[PDB]
Amino acid sequence: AFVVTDNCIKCKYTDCVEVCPVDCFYEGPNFLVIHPDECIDCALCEPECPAQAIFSEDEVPEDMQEFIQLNAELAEVWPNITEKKDPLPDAEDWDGVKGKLQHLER
Ligand code: SF4
Ligand code: F3S
């Protein structure tokens, strides 16, 4: 699996969904997640994210390890997203701010 990590939150550009061949992104109000059993590890989403928030599971930084289980959990509960949409309004303001997990909305 690939995994969405902290910098997506309050950015949610949604560029990643457009290259996914298996439609395995699931949508929250201010974040996306990857369903790990559906993901085929094609790696195509990784370079598309402007937030650079996506990592191979085995490359998730130590300080963002909690995101691996969090993607698995939220992928079960959130609706599928398969089309690009506008980024969140103040995305540029939040891109690169750390610790945005505190702002995650269910
Ligand atoms: S690695 Fe491929 S299959 Fe997995 S989420 Fe990214 S684009 Fe979709
Ligand atoms: S910000 Fe989030 S919505 Fe996709 S393009 Fe990046 S993982």
Side-chain angles (χ1 to χ4, degrees):
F2 279 64
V3 176
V4 188
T5 69
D6 195 88
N7 199 33
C8 174
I9 303 166
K10 282 190 177 285
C11 294
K12 195 193 173 183
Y13 291 103
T14 71
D15 294 73
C16 54
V17 307
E18 81 220 346
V19 304
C20 188
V22 298
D23 293 341
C24 61
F25 286 90
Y26 299 83
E27 183 178 12
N30 69 359
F31 187 53
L32 259 59
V33 298
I34 291 163
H35 200 309
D37 305 313
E38 302 178 354
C39 178
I40 60 156
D41 292 299
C42 73
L44 291 177
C45 57
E46 187 278 346
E48 292 294 302
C49 177
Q52 302 171 17
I54 300 178
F55 296 83
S56 179
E57 178 179 359
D58 55 19
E59 297 181 6
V60 170
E62 196 276 337
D63 70 359
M64 294 188 298
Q65 284 283 311
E66 61 275 37
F67 281 88
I68 300 166
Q69 181 195 20
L70 186 59
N71 275 234
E73 289 270 352
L74 295 171
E76 298 289 341
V77 301
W78 275 351
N80 198 200
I81 175 173
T82 63
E83 277 189 349
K84 161 93 201 178
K85 49 201 283 195
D86 284 352
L88 291 170
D90 298 302
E92 176 172 15
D93 288 353
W94 288 99
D95 191 327
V97 175
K98 300 258 213 142
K100 294 191 295 189
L101 182 53
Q102 71 180 316
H103 295 120
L104 178 61
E105 298 166 15
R106 172 62 197 254

